[PDB]
Design a protein around this ligand. Sequence first.
Ligand SMILES: *C(=O)[C@@H](NC(=O)c1c(OCC)ccc2ccccc12)[C@@H]1N[C@@H](C(=O)O)C(C)(C)S1
Length: 256
Amino acid sequence: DLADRFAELERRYDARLGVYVPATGTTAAIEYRADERFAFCSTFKAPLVAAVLHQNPLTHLDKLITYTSDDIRSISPVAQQHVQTGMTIGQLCDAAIRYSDGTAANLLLADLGGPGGGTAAFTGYLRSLGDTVSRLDPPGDERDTTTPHAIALVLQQLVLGNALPPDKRALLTDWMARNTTGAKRIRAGFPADWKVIDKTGTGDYGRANDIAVVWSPTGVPYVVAVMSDRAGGGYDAEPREALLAEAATCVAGVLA
Ligand SMILES: *C(=O)[C@@H](NC(=O)c1c(OCC)ccc2ccccc12)[C@@H]1N[C@@H](C(=O)O)C(C)(C)S1
């Protein structure tokens, strides 16, 4: 049984784990806590970049955005070394996905505009793709959570579907392919000849997420959503990337 392995991982890492791989032609859904809520964390940044991409002509990626000292409130490795010059929407997009740049995310939200610095327009974007589950706005807390199941179906639609026109779908896909942050999660649990694109998230209460699209060596695709937290260790509990790698390995197994 596959759920025994997963429960084993949860015991080992003293974690709660969430896994969802949506069904295909010959494969059934892989699901484990696939319907419980977990924080979004940085993972929202991927569909956030789709939101922006969808919303505008491609040449909008060339609009220059200025931001100051007070705009830099979270880990922002790219927004630090630009604050002077400014940054383009495309550069912010690049930074949001590939480096999980928090300031880049907050500026891209602000670009979407509307109430709540853009989080309503954002949620609106998710409703439009049939996601009634997620919500952007404390383990368990309703706010800024999604389910392994809801996010995986969102990513499926963005990377393998008609949510974005080929050209814009491509741009999203490329940024995730060249992610710098996911080396030790889903990537690590799949053989080197499977091609894996992903966006990660990480937070307090030992939260660690990875959402990905994978392609078998013969080009068959799957969406893989892995979400976890470790409330057992309190606010300052450490994220366990291993747990994510391991789960992926167990998922790599079934799909190989
Ligand atoms: C999005 O998850 C980012 N995470 C954090 O900035 C973050 C955090 O955010 C609340 C404002 C709270 C606690 C921690 C603890 C340790 C690292 C980061 C945070 C960025 N994304 C992460 C990712 O895995 O994609 C990251 C690159 C480690 S920071």
